[PDB]
Amino acid sequence: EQVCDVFDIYAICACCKVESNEVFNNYTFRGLGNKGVLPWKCISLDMKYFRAVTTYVNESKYEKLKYKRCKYLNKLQNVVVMGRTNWESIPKKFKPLSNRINVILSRTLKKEDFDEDVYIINKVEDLIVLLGKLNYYKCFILGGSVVYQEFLEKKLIKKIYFTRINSTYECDVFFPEINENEYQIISVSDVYTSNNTTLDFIIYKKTDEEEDDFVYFNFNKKNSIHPNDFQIYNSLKYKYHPEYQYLNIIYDIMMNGNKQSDRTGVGVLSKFGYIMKFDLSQYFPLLTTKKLFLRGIIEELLWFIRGETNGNTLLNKNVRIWEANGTREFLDNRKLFHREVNDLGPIYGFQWRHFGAEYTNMYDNYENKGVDQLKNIINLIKNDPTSRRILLCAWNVKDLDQMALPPCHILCQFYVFDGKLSCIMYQRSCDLGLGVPFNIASYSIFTHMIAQVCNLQPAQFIHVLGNAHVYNNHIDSLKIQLNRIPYPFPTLKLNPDIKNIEDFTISDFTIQNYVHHEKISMD
Amino acid sequence: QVCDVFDIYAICACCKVESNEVFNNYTFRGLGNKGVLPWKCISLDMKYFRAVTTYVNESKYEKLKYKRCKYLNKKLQNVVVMGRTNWESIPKKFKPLSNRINVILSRTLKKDVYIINKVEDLIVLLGKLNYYKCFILGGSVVYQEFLEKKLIKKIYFTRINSTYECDVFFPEINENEYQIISVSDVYTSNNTTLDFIIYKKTDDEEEDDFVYFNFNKEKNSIHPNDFQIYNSLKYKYHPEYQYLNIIYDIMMNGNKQSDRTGVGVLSKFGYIMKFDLSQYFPLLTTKKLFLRGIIEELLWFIRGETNGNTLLNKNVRIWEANGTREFLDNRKLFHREVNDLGPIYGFQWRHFGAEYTNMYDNYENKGVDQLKNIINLIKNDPTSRRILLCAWNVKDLDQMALPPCHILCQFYVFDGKLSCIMYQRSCDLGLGVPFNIASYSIFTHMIAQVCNLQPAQFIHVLGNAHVYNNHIDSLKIQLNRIPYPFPTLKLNPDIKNIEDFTISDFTIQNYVHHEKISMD
Ligand SMILES: NC(=O)C1=CN([C@@H]2O[C@H](COP(=O)(O)OP(=O)(O)OC[C@H]3O[C@@H](n4cnc5c(N)ncnc54)[C@H](OP(=O)(O)O)[C@@H]3O)[C@@H](O)[C@H]2O)C=CC1
Ligand SMILES: NC(=O)C1=CN([C@@H]2O[C@H](COP(=O)(O)OP(=O)(O)OC[C@H]3O[C@@H](n4cnc5c(N)ncnc54)[C@H](OP(=O)(O)O)[C@@H]3O)[C@@H](O)[C@H]2O)C=CC1
Ligand SMILES: CCc1nc(N)nc(N)c1OCCCOc1ccc(-c2ccc(C(=O)O)cc2)cc1
Ligand SMILES: CCc1nc(N)nc(N)c1OCCCOc1ccc(-c2ccc(C(=O)O)cc2)cc1
Ligand SMILES: O=c1ccn([C@H]2C[C@H](O)[C@@H](COP(=O)(O)O)O2)c(=O)[nH]1
Ligand SMILES: O=c1ccn([C@H]2C[C@H](O)[C@@H](COP(=O)(O)O)O2)c(=O)[nH]1
C-alpha cells in the first residue's frame, strides 16, 4: 500500500501562464505566486471551487477509510496542509480555513507563534503521524511551491486538482513540472469565465434492485478503427470540456458512421442530425486540439455583410477559401459558362442583402433590390425581440443553380431573452475534419457582432448539423487529434464603439489567450 | 414478506383481446388460446424472456442467501415455476428450459426437474435451494393464485400491441397494489409493435470527482408532487418521452416571455427529437390525436394549392383563422381574397420563385418544382447532401398569410433507407408539435415508398420551443400518464408517385391512446 492511498493525500492548486508562434503544453500553466501573494486579484470561481473541494465530505464513506487506515496501523472534516508562506498569504478573516482541519509546515514558527486553532508540524514525517491520530475524510495539500515540490518528490500525492487560469501574470514561484509518466489527466471540466479570464479545472491521477432492470432493458444491442488508437480519449472519465461536443461527434461518426462515396470519390463516414451548444457568455469556442486562424473567416464574414459576391476582393487580402470555387474550370463544370472567373454568383452576401433580386454580375449596383434580410433581422431583434420569425436564410431555391455552389449554412435563427442573444445555425452539409472548426468560429463571431450592434449580450451559439461527415483521407489525423486534451478556450473582444453591423473592420476583432495544440494537416 | 425474501417475480406477455373504445392497462390481458400462445411466436419477447430469466450476477448473491437464512432461522441460476398446461404447451426442444431450474406446479403429475403439489411447497423448495431469483411463468391459474396471495414482487409485463383470439387472461392488476416503475423503448417484431414495462409492488474516487465538477450547478413556479408519477419512474425509454421530457424541461427552466396575444409562454431554444419509423409510428398515446385533417393538408400541399376553401369544404379548419378578412387585413393584405393564403407551402414546393397572382391562377411549369427535384435526387443521386425542400421564401413571406413554421426538410439515404430532418422555427409544444410529428412522419413514409426505400428516422429540430401558459394544467395531467406502445402506419402499396395518394390510402393500426385532453 502507498502512504498516499492509505491516508488519501491529494494536492490542489491554481496555475496561470507566465511572462516572456509559441509552443503550448501542460507546463504552460505553472504560475503559483508573486511577492508572497497570488499573481492575480481574487478569481471568485476558483475560490468557490477550492472551498467546495476542500470542505466536501461523505460520512458514509468514512467507515471504509477508518478500517483501511486502522488495518495499516493496527462533523467529519477534511485536513488541509499549508506551507508557512502560504499561510501568511491568506487574509486574516479567512483564517483558520473554515470547516477544515488546518495544518502548517514550519521550522521558524512554533505553536506559541499562532493564536489560531491549527496544528504546527516541523517535518512531513510528522504529518503522517498526525493523520494516523486524527479522524478525517481527506487530506488536501494547498501549497505553496516548496510544499508542492516535496510532496510530489516523496510520491505522496494520489491526485492533483489543477485549475488552469487562462491569463498571464507576473510570477516569482511556480508549480513543479508534472511528469507524464507519474501522473496523467483523467478529467476535464466545462470552461468558465470569472473576473475577466477563462479557466477550467482538471484532475491528474497517479499512474440496487433497479440495476438488474437496466441490464434487462439492454437485451437488444462496425468500422475497423482500433479502440487502442483512442487510448487517451477513452481513458478520460469526465469529458466535460465543450470541445468534446465536436470531438465526440467525430468519434461517433468513426465508430458508427455509414460508408458512402461523394462527388470526389474519396468516400466519407456519414451520420445525420446532431446539435452542439456553445456558451459564448463563458468562452469563445475556438478549437484547441489543433491550431486555427481567424483572419480569413473574419474577412469572409465582413465580405458577406457588405453584400459582395466578388472573389477577387478576398484574393487581394490573400484569403483563398473561395479560390477553388471560382476557377474557369469549376465554373464551367457548374455550367456557368457565361460567368467571369471569381464571380461566385448570388451567394451568401447577395442573399443576405438582396434576396430575390436578379443577379447580373459581381460588379453591379444592387442597392435597394431584393430583401435586405440582414437589416430586417437587426430591426426585429431591436424592436420585436420575442418574434419567432428572426431568421436569415441563404438558401434561395431559385438562384441555387446560378451559385458557384449552394450554401452549406442554410439559416440562422435568433432568440432574445433578458437582454441576451442566442443563435441557431442549421448546416446541411458538415465536413467534420476541416470545415466545422471554422464554421463554429464564424457564426460565434457573427452572434457577437449581431448581439453587440443590438445592445444585447451573447448567450448561446447552437449548431445543428444535418449530413455530418468525416472524409476517409482525414481519419488518421482525426485519430491523433482525438487523443489530445483540450486547453481552456480563448475570449473574443470586439471594439465597443462599433454600433452598426456594416461598420466593422478586421482590426475591431481581438482573440485573447488562445492556447492550442500543434497545427495539423488533415491530409 | 415472502416475495421480498425469496425474490418471487412474475414475467408475462399480453396481447389485446377480440370482442368509442376506452383503453387502460387491462387492454393488455391476453395470455393463451386453446392451450397455446395466442400469437405465432414473437421473437423479441422470447429473447427478452430468456435473457431476463437466465440473467444472474453472482456478486449479489451473498446478501440474498444471508437474508433467506436469517428468515428460515438458519453455478447460480434462477428458478422458473410453471403450471402443467404451461409446461406442456412448451415444445420439447425447449423443455427443460435450458440453464434454469425448472419447477412444475401440478396436482396430478408424478415425480433435476422438481414437481410441487401446492404453493407452500415452493417456499420450502426455495428455502432448500441456491438460486438468484424466482420467476413465475404462468399460466393464468398460477398467476391468479400467486397474485391473490401477495407472493409477487414485480411483474415484467410485455405489452403485445395487436389483437388475437384468446380463451385465457391475465388477472386484472390492482393499481392500489402495483404501479409501473419503468417502460422500455418501442419495437416491432413479427408484424406487431411491442414494449416492456415493469410493475413494482407498493472506484468512488470518481464519485467525489463528479460532485466537485457539479460545484456551480444551482423559475420553477411548478411543484414536485405535480409530477409524482412522472418523477417516480426509473427508466423512461419510451420515445414518447422525447416529447414529454421537452415539456418538463420547458415547464421547469423555461423563460417567461409574452407573445402578441398577451397569452404568455415559457420558451426555450434548440431541441432535437428522433423517432425510429422502422419500429413504430410516433402518434402520441398520452392523449387522443386525429389524423384526417393533417393528411388532407399534406395532400393539399402536394397538389401545390393555396386555396383555403379546398380544405374548409372537407371540414379541415387548420388554416381557417389564417384566411379570415380580419387576419389578412392585420397582415396588410387588403387586396387578398378571404381564404387565399397566398404563396405558402404548396406554392413553394411546386412553384418556388413564380410570381403569385391569386389562388385560382394556373401556375403549370412556373417556378421550381422542388418536390419533383428532391424526389428525383433521392432516386438518382441518393448521396447528395443537397436534397432539401424549403418553404422559407424570403421574397414571398410578406405576401403569405403567415410565414411557414416548418422551414425545411432535409433527406438522407443509406442502404435503401430514407431519413428526414425537419427544422421548425416555432413549436407550440402543447397543441402543434404532436400533430407536426405525425405530419412529417407520414410525409417521410410517403416520400420513401415512392422512391422504393424503407423509412428510417424522422428527426425534428425545434427552434423557438414554447408552452402556452393556458396549456400548463393540461400538460400536467399529460406528463403523469404512461405511454402505451405506439401504433403503425400502413400506406396502400400500389401508390408509386407522390401525387397519387388519396385519403383512403392511409391506415393507422393498433392506436392505443389515453383519453382526449381539452388543451384548455
Ligand atoms: N496558486 C495556488 O494554487 C497557490 C499559491 N500559493 C502561493 O505560493 C507562494 C508560497 O509558496 P512558497 O514560496 O513555495 O512557500 P510555501 O508556502 O511552500 O512555504 C514554504 C515554507 O513552509 C515551511 N516548510 C515547507 N516544507 C517544510 C518541511 N518539510 N518541514 C518544515 N517546514 C517546512 C518553511 O517555513 P519556515 O520558513 O517558517 O520554516 C518553508 O520556508 C505564495 O506566493 C502563495 O500565494 C500558495 C498556495 C497555493
Ligand atoms: N403469455 C404468457 O405470458 C403465458 C401464456 N401461457 C399460456 O397460458 C395457458 C395456460 O394457462 P392455464 O390454462 O391457466 O394453465 P396453467 O399453466 O395455469 O396450468 C394450471 C394447472 O397447474 C396445476 N396447478 C395450478 N395451481 C395449482 C396449485 N395451487 N396446486 C397444485 N397444482 C396447481 C394444475 O394442474 P393439475 O391438473 O395437474 O392439477 C392446474 O390445473 C396456455 O394457453 C399457455 O400457452 C403460458 C405461459 C405464460
Ligand atoms: C487561490 C486559492 C486556491 N485555489 C486552488 N484551486 N488551489 C489552491 N491550493 C488555492 O490556494 C489555497 C491557499 C491560499 O488560500 C487563499 C489565498 C488567498 C485568499 C484571498 C481572498 C481574498 C483576497 C482579496 O480580495 O483581496 C485575496 C486573497 C483566500 C484563500
Ligand atoms: C412467450 C414467452 C414469455 N414471455 C414473457 N414475457 N413471459 C412469459 N411468461 C412467457 O412465456 C412463459 C413460458 C414460455 O414458454 C414457451 C416457450 C416457447 C414457445 C414456442 C412456441 C412456438 C414456437 C414455434 O412455433 O416455433 C417456438 C417456441 C412457447 C412457450
Ligand atoms: O462553408 C462550408 C462549405 C463547404 N463545406 C464542406 C462540406 C462538404 O464536404 C463540402 C460541400 O458539400 P456539398 O456541396 O456536396 O454538400 O464542403 C463546409 O464544411 N463548410
Ligand atoms: O403547423 C403549425 C402551425 C403553427 N404552429 C404554431 C407555432 C406558434 O405557436 C405559432 C406560429 O406563430 P408565429 O411563430 O408565426 O408568431 O403557431 C405550430 O406549431 N404548427
Coordinates of all heavy atoms in Angstrom, one line a residue, chain A residues 10 61 137-138 159 161 205 208-210 212-213 219 238 258-260 270 273 277 355 388 413 415-416 426 428 471, chain B residues 9 47 60 132 154 156 204-206 208-209 235 255 257 267 269-270 274 383 385 394 410 412-414 423 425 468:
Chain A
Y10 N -4.2 14.3 -1.3 CA -4.3 15.0 -2.6 C -3.7 16.3 -2.5 O -3.4 16.8 -1.5 CB -5.8 15.2 -3.0 CG -6.6 13.9 -2.9 CD1 -7.2 13.5 -1.7 CD2 -6.8 13.1 -4.0 CE1 -7.9 12.4 -1.6 CE2 -7.6 12.0 -4.0 CZ -8.1 11.6 -2.8 OH -8.9 10.5 -2.6
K61 N -18.8 7.1 3.7 CA -17.5 6.5 3.2 C -16.4 6.5 4.3 O -15.4 5.9 4.1 CB -17.0 7.3 1.9 CG -17.9 7.1 0.6 CD -17.3 8.0 -0.5 CE -18.1 7.9 -1.8 NZ -17.6 9.0 -2.8
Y137 N -11.8 12.9 6.7 CA -12.2 12.3 5.4 C -11.0 12.3 4.5 O -10.3 11.3 4.4 CB -13.3 13.1 4.8 CG -13.9 12.5 3.6 CD1 -14.5 11.2 3.6 CD2 -14.0 13.2 2.4 CE1 -15.0 10.6 2.4 CE2 -14.6 12.6 1.2 CZ -15.1 11.4 1.3 OH -15.6 10.8 0.1
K138 N -10.6 13.5 4.0 CA -9.5 13.5 3.0 C -8.5 14.6 3.4 O -8.8 15.5 4.2 CB -9.9 13.7 1.6 CG -10.7 12.5 1.0 CD -11.2 12.8 -0.4 CE -11.6 11.5 -1.1 NZ -12.2 11.8 -2.4
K159 N -3.7 12.4 -6.3 CA -4.3 13.1 -7.4 C -4.1 14.6 -7.2 O -4.0 15.0 -6.0 CB -5.8 13.0 -7.6 CG -6.3 11.6 -7.8 CD -7.8 11.8 -8.0 CE -8.5 10.6 -8.5 NZ -10.0 10.8 -8.5
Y161 N -5.7 18.2 -8.2 CA -6.8 19.0 -8.7 C -6.3 20.3 -9.1 O -5.7 21.1 -8.4 CB -7.9 19.1 -7.6 CG -8.6 17.7 -7.3 CD1 -8.1 16.9 -6.2 CD2 -9.7 17.3 -7.9 CE1 -8.7 15.7 -5.9 CE2 -10.3 16.1 -7.6 CZ -9.8 15.3 -6.6 OH -10.4 14.1 -6.3
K205 N -4.3 12.0 -12.3 CA -4.2 10.8 -11.5 C -2.9 10.2 -11.5 O -2.2 10.2 -12.6 CB -5.4 9.9 -11.9 CG -5.8 8.8 -10.9 CD -6.3 7.5 -11.6 CE -7.0 6.6 -10.6 NZ -8.2 7.1 -10.0
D208 N -30.3 -1.2 -5.1 CA -29.5 -1.8 -6.2 C -30.3 -3.0 -6.8 O -29.7 -3.8 -7.5 CB -28.1 -2.2 -5.8 CG -27.9 -3.2 -4.7 OD1 -28.2 -2.9 -3.5 OD2 -27.5 -4.3 -5.0
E209 N -31.6 -3.0 -6.6 CA -32.5 -3.9 -7.3 C -32.6 -3.5 -8.8 O -32.4 -4.3 -9.7 CB -33.8 -3.9 -6.6 CG -35.1 -4.4 -7.3 CD -35.1 -5.8 -7.9 OE1 -34.7 -6.7 -7.1 OE2 -35.5 -6.0 -9.0
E210 N -32.8 -2.1 -8.9 CA -33.1 -1.5 -10.2 C -31.9 -1.6 -11.2 O -32.0 -1.1 -12.3 CB -33.4 0.0 -10.0 CG -34.8 0.2 -9.4 CD -35.0 1.4 -8.4 OE1 -34.6 2.6 -8.7 OE2 -35.6 1.1 -7.4
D212 N -30.6 -4.5 -12.2 CA -30.8 -5.7 -13.0 C -31.8 -5.3 -14.1 O -31.6 -5.8 -15.2 CB -31.2 -6.9 -12.1 CG -30.1 -7.6 -11.3 OD1 -29.0 -7.1 -11.2 OD2 -30.4 -8.7 -10.9
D213 N -32.8 -4.5 -13.7 CA -33.8 -4.0 -14.7 C -33.1 -3.2 -15.8 O -33.6 -3.3 -17.0 CB -34.9 -3.2 -14.0 CG -35.7 -3.9 -13.0 OD1 -35.8 -5.2 -13.0 OD2 -36.4 -3.2 -12.2
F219 N -31.2 -5.8 -23.5 CA -31.1 -7.1 -24.0 C -31.0 -7.1 -25.6 O -31.0 -8.2 -26.1 CB -32.3 -7.9 -23.7 CG -33.5 -7.6 -24.5 CD1 -34.1 -8.4 -25.4 CD2 -34.2 -6.3 -24.3 CE1 -35.2 -8.1 -26.2 CE2 -35.3 -6.0 -25.0 CZ -35.8 -6.9 -26.0
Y238 N -14.2 12.0 -17.2 CA -15.1 13.1 -17.4 C -14.7 14.0 -18.5 O -13.7 14.7 -18.4 CB -15.3 13.9 -16.1 CG -16.0 13.0 -15.0 CD1 -15.3 12.6 -13.9 CD2 -17.4 12.6 -15.2 CE1 -15.9 11.8 -12.9 CE2 -18.0 11.8 -14.2 CZ -17.3 11.4 -13.1 OH -17.9 10.6 -12.1
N258 N -21.7 5.6 -41.7 CA -22.1 4.8 -42.8 C -21.1 5.1 -43.9 O -20.7 6.3 -44.1 CB -23.5 5.1 -43.2 CG -24.5 4.7 -42.1 OD1 -24.4 3.6 -41.6 ND2 -25.4 5.6 -41.7
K259 N -20.6 4.1 -44.6 CA -19.7 4.3 -45.7 C -20.5 4.7 -46.8 O -21.5 4.1 -47.1 CB -18.8 3.1 -46.1 CG -18.0 2.5 -45.0 CD -16.6 2.0 -45.5 CE -16.0 0.9 -44.7 NZ -16.1 1.2 -43.3
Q260 N -20.2 5.8 -47.5 CA -20.8 6.4 -48.7 C -19.7 7.0 -49.6 O -18.6 7.3 -49.0 CB -21.9 7.4 -48.5 CG -22.9 7.0 -47.5 CD -24.2 7.8 -47.4 OE1 -25.3 7.3 -47.6 NE2 -24.1 9.1 -47.0
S270 N -20.6 8.9 -42.7 CA -21.6 9.9 -42.6 C -22.5 9.5 -41.4 O -22.8 8.3 -41.2 CB -22.4 10.1 -43.8 OG -23.2 9.0 -44.1
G273 N -27.8 14.4 -38.3 CA -28.6 15.1 -37.3 C -27.9 15.1 -35.9 O -28.0 14.2 -35.1
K277 N -24.0 22.9 -28.6 CA -24.3 24.2 -28.0 C -23.1 24.8 -27.4 O -22.4 24.1 -26.6 CB -25.4 24.0 -26.9 CG -26.6 23.3 -27.4 CD -27.9 23.8 -26.7 CE -29.2 23.1 -27.2 NZ -30.3 23.6 -26.5
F355 N -32.0 39.3 -51.3 CA -32.7 38.1 -51.8 C -33.9 38.5 -52.7 O -34.7 39.3 -52.3 CB -33.1 37.3 -50.5 CG -33.7 36.0 -50.7 CD1 -33.3 34.9 -49.9 CD2 -34.8 35.8 -51.5 CE1 -34.1 33.7 -49.9 CE2 -35.5 34.6 -51.6 CZ -35.1 33.5 -50.8
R388 N -40.7 35.0 -33.3 CA -40.2 33.7 -33.6 C -39.9 33.7 -35.1 O -40.0 32.6 -35.7 CB -41.2 32.7 -33.2 CG -41.6 33.1 -31.8 CD -42.7 32.2 -31.2 NE -44.1 32.7 -31.4 CZ -44.9 32.4 -30.4 NH1 -44.5 32.5 -29.2 NH2 -46.2 32.1 -30.8
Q413 N -31.3 31.3 -37.0 CA -32.4 31.8 -36.3 C -31.9 32.4 -35.0 O -30.9 31.9 -34.4 CB -33.5 30.7 -36.0 CG -34.7 31.3 -35.4 CD -35.8 30.3 -35.2 OE1 -35.7 29.1 -35.3 NE2 -37.0 30.8 -34.8
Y415 N -32.8 34.3 -31.1 CA -33.5 34.2 -29.8 C -33.0 35.2 -28.9 O -31.8 35.3 -28.7 CB -33.5 32.7 -29.4 CG -34.4 32.4 -28.1 CD1 -35.7 32.2 -28.2 CD2 -33.8 32.5 -26.8 CE1 -36.4 31.9 -27.0 CE2 -34.5 32.3 -25.7 CZ -35.8 32.0 -25.8 OH -36.6 31.8 -24.6
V416 N -33.9 36.0 -28.3 CA -33.6 37.0 -27.3 C -34.4 36.8 -26.1 O -35.7 36.7 -26.1 CB -34.0 38.4 -27.9 CG1 -33.8 39.5 -26.8 CG2 -33.3 38.8 -29.2
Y426 N -28.2 26.2 -38.9 CA -28.5 24.9 -39.5 C -27.6 24.7 -40.7 O -27.5 25.4 -41.7 CB -30.0 24.8 -39.9 CG -30.3 23.4 -40.4 CD1 -30.6 22.3 -39.6 CD2 -30.0 23.1 -41.8 CE1 -30.8 21.0 -40.1 CE2 -30.1 21.8 -42.3 CZ -30.5 20.8 -41.4 OH -30.7 19.5 -41.9
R428 N -26.5 22.1 -43.6 CA -27.0 21.0 -44.4 C -25.8 20.0 -44.6 O -26.1 18.8 -44.8 CB -27.5 21.4 -45.7 CG -26.5 22.0 -46.7 CD -27.0 21.9 -48.2 NE -26.0 22.5 -49.1 CZ -25.0 21.8 -49.6 NH1 -24.9 20.5 -49.5 NH2 -24.0 22.4 -50.3
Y471 N -14.3 12.8 -44.0 CA -13.6 12.2 -45.1 C -12.6 11.1 -44.7 O -12.1 11.2 -43.6 CB -12.9 13.3 -46.0 CG -13.8 14.1 -46.8 CD1 -14.1 15.5 -46.5 CD2 -14.5 13.6 -47.9 CE1 -15.0 16.2 -47.2 CE2 -15.4 14.4 -48.6 CZ -15.6 15.7 -48.3 OH -16.5 16.4 -49.0
Chain B
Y9 N -40.8 -13.0 -8.6 CA -41.4 -12.1 -9.6 C -42.3 -12.9 -10.6 O -42.1 -14.1 -10.7 CB -40.3 -11.3 -10.3 CG -39.2 -10.7 -9.5 CD1 -38.0 -11.3 -9.4 CD2 -39.4 -9.5 -8.8 CE1 -37.0 -10.7 -8.6 CE2 -38.5 -8.9 -8.1 CZ -37.2 -9.5 -7.9 OH -36.2 -9.0 -7.2
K47 N -36.6 -13.5 -26.7 CA -35.2 -13.2 -26.4 C -35.2 -12.4 -25.1 O -34.2 -12.5 -24.3 CB -34.6 -12.4 -27.6 CG -33.1 -12.8 -27.9 CD -32.5 -12.0 -29.1 CE -32.7 -10.5 -29.0 NZ -32.0 -10.0 -27.8
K60 N -23.9 -10.6 -6.1 CA -25.0 -10.0 -5.4 C -25.7 -11.1 -4.5 O -26.5 -10.8 -3.7 CB -26.0 -9.4 -6.3 CG -25.4 -8.3 -7.2 CD -26.3 -7.7 -8.3 CE -27.5 -6.9 -7.7 NZ -28.0 -6.0 -8.7
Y132 N -30.7 -17.4 -7.8 CA -30.7 -15.9 -7.8 C -32.1 -15.4 -7.5 O -32.3 -14.8 -6.5 CB -30.1 -15.5 -9.2 CG -29.8 -14.0 -9.2 CD1 -29.0 -13.4 -8.3 CD2 -30.3 -13.2 -10.3 CE1 -28.7 -12.1 -8.3 CE2 -30.0 -11.8 -10.3 CZ -29.2 -11.3 -9.3 OH -28.8 -9.9 -9.2
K154 N -42.4 -8.1 -8.4 CA -42.5 -7.3 -9.6 C -43.1 -8.1 -10.7 O -43.0 -9.4 -10.7 CB -41.2 -6.8 -10.2 CG -40.4 -5.7 -9.3 CD -39.1 -5.3 -9.9 CE -38.6 -4.1 -9.3 NZ -37.3 -3.6 -9.8
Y156 N -42.9 -8.3 -14.8 CA -42.3 -7.9 -16.1 C -43.3 -8.2 -17.2 O -43.5 -9.3 -17.5 CB -40.9 -8.6 -16.2 CG -39.9 -8.2 -15.1 CD1 -40.1 -8.6 -13.8 CD2 -38.9 -7.4 -15.3 CE1 -39.2 -8.3 -12.8 CE2 -38.0 -7.0 -14.3 CZ -38.1 -7.4 -13.0 OH -37.3 -7.1 -12.1
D204 N -15.1 4.9 -6.1 CA -15.9 6.1 -5.7 C -14.9 7.3 -5.4 O -15.3 8.2 -4.7 CB -16.9 5.8 -4.7 CG -16.4 5.0 -3.5 OD1 -15.2 4.6 -3.4 OD2 -17.3 4.7 -2.6
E205 N -13.7 7.2 -5.9 CA -12.8 8.3 -6.1 C -13.4 9.2 -7.2 O -13.4 10.5 -7.0 CB -11.4 7.8 -6.6 CG -10.4 7.8 -5.5 CD -10.5 9.1 -4.7 OE1 -10.2 10.2 -5.2 OE2 -10.9 8.9 -3.5
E206 N -14.0 8.6 -8.2 CA -14.6 9.3 -9.3 C -16.0 9.7 -8.9 O -16.6 10.6 -9.5 CB -14.7 8.4 -10.6 CG -13.5 7.6 -10.9 CD -12.1 8.2 -10.9 OE1 -11.9 9.2 -11.6 OE2 -11.2 7.8 -10.1
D208 N -16.5 11.2 -6.0 CA -16.3 12.5 -5.4 C -16.0 13.5 -6.5 O -16.5 14.6 -6.5 CB -15.3 12.6 -4.3 CG -15.7 12.0 -2.9 OD1 -16.9 11.6 -2.8 OD2 -14.9 11.8 -2.0
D209 N -15.3 13.1 -7.5 CA -14.9 14.0 -8.6 C -16.2 14.5 -9.3 O -16.3 15.7 -9.6 CB -13.9 13.3 -9.5 CG -12.6 13.1 -8.9 OD1 -12.3 13.6 -7.7 OD2 -11.8 12.4 -9.5
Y235 N -36.8 4.1 -15.4 CA -36.4 4.0 -16.8 C -37.6 4.6 -17.6 O -38.7 4.1 -17.5 CB -35.9 2.6 -17.2 CG -34.8 2.2 -16.3 CD1 -34.8 1.0 -15.6 CD2 -33.7 3.0 -16.2 CE1 -33.7 0.7 -14.8 CE2 -32.6 2.7 -15.4 CZ -32.6 1.5 -14.7 OH -31.5 1.3 -14.0
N255 N -38.1 30.3 -20.1 CA -38.0 31.7 -19.9 C -39.5 32.2 -20.1 O -40.1 31.9 -21.1 CB -37.1 32.3 -20.9 CG -35.7 31.7 -20.8 OD1 -35.2 31.6 -19.7 ND2 -35.1 31.3 -21.9
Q257 N -41.9 34.8 -21.2 CA -41.9 35.7 -22.3 C -43.3 35.8 -22.7 O -44.1 34.8 -22.6 CB -41.2 35.2 -23.5 CG -39.6 35.1 -23.4 CD -38.9 34.9 -24.7 OE1 -39.1 34.0 -25.5 NE2 -37.9 35.8 -24.9
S267 N -40.6 29.6 -22.9 CA -39.9 29.2 -24.1 C -38.5 28.8 -23.8 O -37.9 29.3 -22.9 CB -40.1 30.3 -25.1 OG -39.1 31.3 -24.8
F269 N -34.8 27.3 -26.4 CA -34.3 27.4 -27.8 C -33.4 26.2 -28.1 O -32.3 26.1 -27.5 CB -33.5 28.7 -27.9 CG -33.3 29.2 -29.4 CD1 -34.3 29.3 -30.3 CD2 -32.1 29.7 -29.7 CE1 -34.1 29.8 -31.5 CE2 -31.8 30.2 -31.0 CZ -32.9 30.2 -31.9
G270 N -33.7 25.4 -29.1 CA -32.8 24.4 -29.6 C -33.1 23.0 -29.0 O -32.6 22.7 -27.9
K274 N -35.8 12.4 -32.2 CA -35.5 11.5 -33.3 C -36.5 10.3 -33.0 O -36.5 9.8 -31.9 CB -34.1 11.0 -33.3 CG -33.0 12.1 -33.6 CD -31.7 11.3 -33.9 CE -30.6 12.3 -34.2 NZ -29.4 11.5 -34.6
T383 N -26.7 10.1 -52.6 CA -25.7 10.5 -51.6 C -25.6 12.0 -51.6 O -24.7 12.6 -50.9 CB -24.4 9.8 -51.7 OG1 -23.7 10.3 -52.9 CG2 -24.7 8.3 -51.8
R385 N -26.0 15.8 -50.6 CA -26.3 16.5 -49.4 C -27.1 17.7 -49.7 O -27.1 18.7 -49.0 CB -24.9 16.8 -48.8 CG -24.1 15.5 -48.7 CD -22.7 15.7 -48.1 NE -21.7 16.1 -49.1 CZ -20.5 15.5 -49.2 NH1 -20.3 14.3 -48.6 NH2 -19.5 16.1 -49.8
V394 N -37.9 34.0 -48.7 CA -37.7 35.3 -48.1 C -38.5 36.4 -48.9 O -39.0 37.3 -48.3 CB -36.2 35.6 -48.0 CG1 -36.0 37.0 -47.3 CG2 -35.4 34.5 -47.2
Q410 N -34.7 18.1 -44.8 CA -33.5 17.6 -45.5 C -33.7 16.1 -45.4 O -34.1 15.5 -44.4 CB -32.2 18.2 -44.9 CG -31.0 17.7 -45.7 CD -29.6 18.2 -45.3 OE1 -29.4 18.9 -44.3 NE2 -28.6 17.7 -46.0
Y412 N -31.9 12.1 -46.4 CA -30.6 11.4 -46.3 C -31.0 9.9 -46.6 O -31.9 9.3 -46.1 CB -30.0 11.6 -45.0 CG -28.8 10.7 -44.6 CD1 -27.5 11.2 -44.9 CD2 -29.0 9.5 -43.9 CE1 -26.4 10.4 -44.5 CE2 -27.9 8.8 -43.5 CZ -26.6 9.2 -43.8 OH -25.5 8.4 -43.4
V413 N -30.1 9.3 -47.4 CA -30.4 7.9 -47.9 C -29.1 7.1 -47.6 O -28.0 7.5 -48.0 CB -30.6 8.0 -49.4 CG1 -30.8 6.6 -50.1 CG2 -31.8 8.9 -49.8
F414 N -29.3 6.0 -46.9 CA -28.3 5.0 -46.7 C -28.9 3.6 -46.8 O -30.0 3.4 -46.1 CB -27.5 5.1 -45.4 CG -26.4 4.1 -45.3 CD1 -25.3 4.1 -46.2 CD2 -26.4 3.1 -44.4 CE1 -24.3 3.1 -46.1 CE2 -25.4 2.1 -44.3 CZ -24.3 2.2 -45.1
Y423 N -36.8 21.1 -39.7 CA -36.4 22.3 -38.8 C -37.6 23.2 -38.7 O -38.1 23.7 -39.7 CB -35.3 23.1 -39.4 CG -34.8 24.3 -38.5 CD1 -33.9 24.0 -37.6 CD2 -35.5 25.5 -38.6 CE1 -33.5 25.0 -36.6 CE2 -35.1 26.5 -37.7 CZ -34.1 26.3 -36.8 OH -33.8 27.3 -35.9
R425 N -39.1 26.6 -36.9 CA -38.7 27.8 -36.2 C -39.6 28.1 -35.0 O -39.1 28.8 -34.1 CB -38.8 28.9 -37.3 CG -40.2 29.3 -37.7 CD -40.3 30.7 -38.4 NE -41.6 30.9 -38.8 CZ -42.6 31.4 -38.0 NH1 -42.2 31.9 -36.8 NH2 -43.8 31.5 -38.4
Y468 N -47.6 27.4 -24.1 CA -48.6 28.4 -23.7 C -49.0 28.3 -22.3 O -49.2 27.1 -21.8 CB -49.8 28.3 -24.7 CG -49.5 29.0 -26.0 CD1 -49.1 28.2 -27.2 CD2 -49.4 30.3 -26.2 CE1 -48.8 28.8 -28.4 CE2 -49.1 31.0 -27.4 CZ -48.8 30.2 -28.5 OH -48.5 30.9 -29.6

